């Protein structure tokens, strides 16, 4: 049951999560300038809304 190290695998799963999160985040780098402008405006909305909420 242990011949393929289970504790090593459950310590390896942060690397799996990091690779998955990196592949997911790389979808935002699609190379489209209109999306870059849109993401800047989204970030502006988020920053202003956070500042108004926090006051």
């Amino acid at each position: 049951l242990l011949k393929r190290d289970p504790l090593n695998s459950m310590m390896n799963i942060p690397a799996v999560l990091s690779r998955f999160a990196g592949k997911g985040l790389l979808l935002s780098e699609n190379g489209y300038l209109r999306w870059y402008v849109a993401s800047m405006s989204i970030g502006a909305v988020v920053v202003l809304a956070l500042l108004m909420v926090l006051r």
């Binding site: 979808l27 780098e29 190379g31 489209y32 300038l33 209109r34 402008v37 849109a38 405006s41």
Partner: protein
Amino acid sequence: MIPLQHGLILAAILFVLGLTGLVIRRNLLFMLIGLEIMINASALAFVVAGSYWGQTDGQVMYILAISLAAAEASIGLALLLQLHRRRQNLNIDSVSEMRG
């Protein structure tokens, strides 16, 4: 007798409309037009704020703003002309080669 809130709201409306024009338009010329609307709106907001305080600094900030607007309109139109003469196409979605 004119409120500061009304002038700032007018400037905010123009800025938001220019940003919308920059986002929704696929032609690079209309993106430059939206940029010009945004920078003119920010300069108008500076003029409104300076007129509220009775200070000349608002018009000085306007002068620096329109210096920037003129120079970056020149640069953006030069790049637009280069894109037109190299691709015969002003679609901004076509110039998307570099990607993650």
